[PDB]
């Protein structure tokens, strides 16, 4: 690659130190044309560093740039809740060679903690429409793996469901996830206990929460 | 500093759409202005850029398939020919990549590229509950099912509560249409009282619903 950027992920807790590395085939221009930048979810990405250390305005001097030539550094120092972000280096090689690294995920360690566990049966509204959704959520947990498993009647449900993952909570440093199983109103209503399992480092034993349809 | 994008959104395999970006707090004439996009999931990834002069400069991959102009006022990116693999994010940037300059970005405009028909959502209520409910704190949300293309926004009480919401990620369903859920904590004591509404806002339809989510009468 022109821009070689590793690892894919670093981790440190509130209070660290990460560092991010980025080599380029060649000498970037002025010995210094190299920059950082910091992306979170929705947003383009913020401009930290240019010219190698030269900090862009607003940005705290706990973010330090180093290096030369083709081997460049970005040292986090007081790692803050709200670093939990994608970041990038990107050069100028000279030729009109402008290129990104591949990314560094940073990912704020925190104390493990159990996901709070949701389960919502399908609105009357949808099933009039023929389908029926059954959503579990897995509430402000840490670390980010978690396993769920989908219940009907004791069936175990098996790829009828899918599953999405918020980023790091830029605060409390937690994530969620959300689970929904689809089923036909035939399928829904033929069925009463609906079940969600979640396995998880924070739980010495699988939660579940379950409703029987229709009962209030 | 500002720059604005616009002229995103649907198109058609092998068609063509144009982006451009404006400018606010600074004379974009004065500056090169690059265009990186960013695929689903994936890094930044420079196309090209473009001189005071009107002189283009493109990454390897990208030349043919890419055209960079400017105006006085503008600066804008022409996709030719585009496959699905060119649905992404795409940005303007002041400057190059690597440049002191490009401190201000646009916020980016999704381009995708598909053959299949916008559809606004179908907004269901996540009510709160039995199942629902721990130490005095219960979750409620908004089902927004089956639109195309991305995105959507999702607020609640109209951007009064904020804290304790999460708004997921959206999926692709095997339907070829998108899904999300966003859900909010409150006070399972406050369930009776307080009205908690989710605004959805698909833009590509010009679809808003207004979905006031309460527990079910059982």
């Known amino acids: 690659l022109d821009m070689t950027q590793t690892p894919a992920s670093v981790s440190a807790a509130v209070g660290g130190t990460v560092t991010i590395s980025c080599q380029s085939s060649?000498?970037?221009?002025?010995?210094?044309?190299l920059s950082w930048y910091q992306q979170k979810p929705g947003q383009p990405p913020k401009l930290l560093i240019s010219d190698a250390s030269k900090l862009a305005s607003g940005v705290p001097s706990r973010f330090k740039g180093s290096g030369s030539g083709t081997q460049f550094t970005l040292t986090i120092s007081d790692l803050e809740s709200d670093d939990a972000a994608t970041y990038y280096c990107?050069?100028?090689?000279?030729?009109?060679?402008?290129?990104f690294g591949g990314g560094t995920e940073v990912v704020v360690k925190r104390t493990v903690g159990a996901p709070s566990v949701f389960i919502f049966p399908p609105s009357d509204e949808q099933l009039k429409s023929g389908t029926a959704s059954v959503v579990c959520l897995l509430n402000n947990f840490y670390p980010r793996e978690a396993k769920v498993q989908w219940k009907v009647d004791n069936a175990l449900q098996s790829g009828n469901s899918q599953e999405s993952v918020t980023e790091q909570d830029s605060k409390d440093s937690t994530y969620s996830l959300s689970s929904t199983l689809t089923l036909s109103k035939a399928d829904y209503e033929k069925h009463k206990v609906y079940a969600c399992e979640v396995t998880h480092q924070g739980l010495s034993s699988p939660v579940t929460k379950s409703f029987n349809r229709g009962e209030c | 500093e500002q720059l604005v994008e616009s002229g995103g959104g649907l198109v058609t395999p092998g068609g063509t759409l144009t982006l451009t970006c404006t400018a606010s707090?600074?004379?974009?004439?004065?500056?090169?202005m690059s265009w990186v996009r960013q695929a689903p999931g994936k890094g930044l990834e420079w196309i090209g850029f473009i001189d005071t002069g009107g002189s283009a400069a493109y990454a390897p991959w990208a030349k043919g398939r890419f055209t960079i102009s400017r105006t006085s006022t503008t600066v804008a990116l022409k996709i030719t020919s585009p496959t699905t693999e060119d649905t992404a994010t795409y940005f303007c940037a002041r400057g190059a990549p690597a440049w002191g300059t490009a401190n201000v970005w646009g916020q980016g405009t999704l381009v995708t590229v598909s053959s299949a028909s916008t559809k606004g959502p179908s907004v269901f209520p996540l009510a709160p509950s039995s199942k629902s409910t721990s130490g005095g704190t219960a979750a409620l949300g908004c089902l927004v099912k089956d639109y195309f293309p991305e995105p959507v926004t999702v607020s609640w009480n109209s951007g009064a509560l904020t804290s304790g919401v999460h708004t997921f990620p959206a999926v692709l369903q095997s339907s070829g249409l998108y899904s999300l859920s966003s859900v909010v904590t409150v006070p399972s004591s406050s369930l009776g009282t307080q009205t908690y509404i989710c605004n959805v806002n698909h833009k590509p339809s010009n679809t808003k619903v207004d979905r006031r989510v309460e527990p079910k009468s059982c």
């Open positions: 990107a050069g100028d090689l000279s030729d009109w060679i402008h290129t």
């Open positions: 060649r000498s970037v221009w002025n010995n210094n044309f």
């Open positions: 707090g600074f004379t974009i004439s004065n500056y090169h």
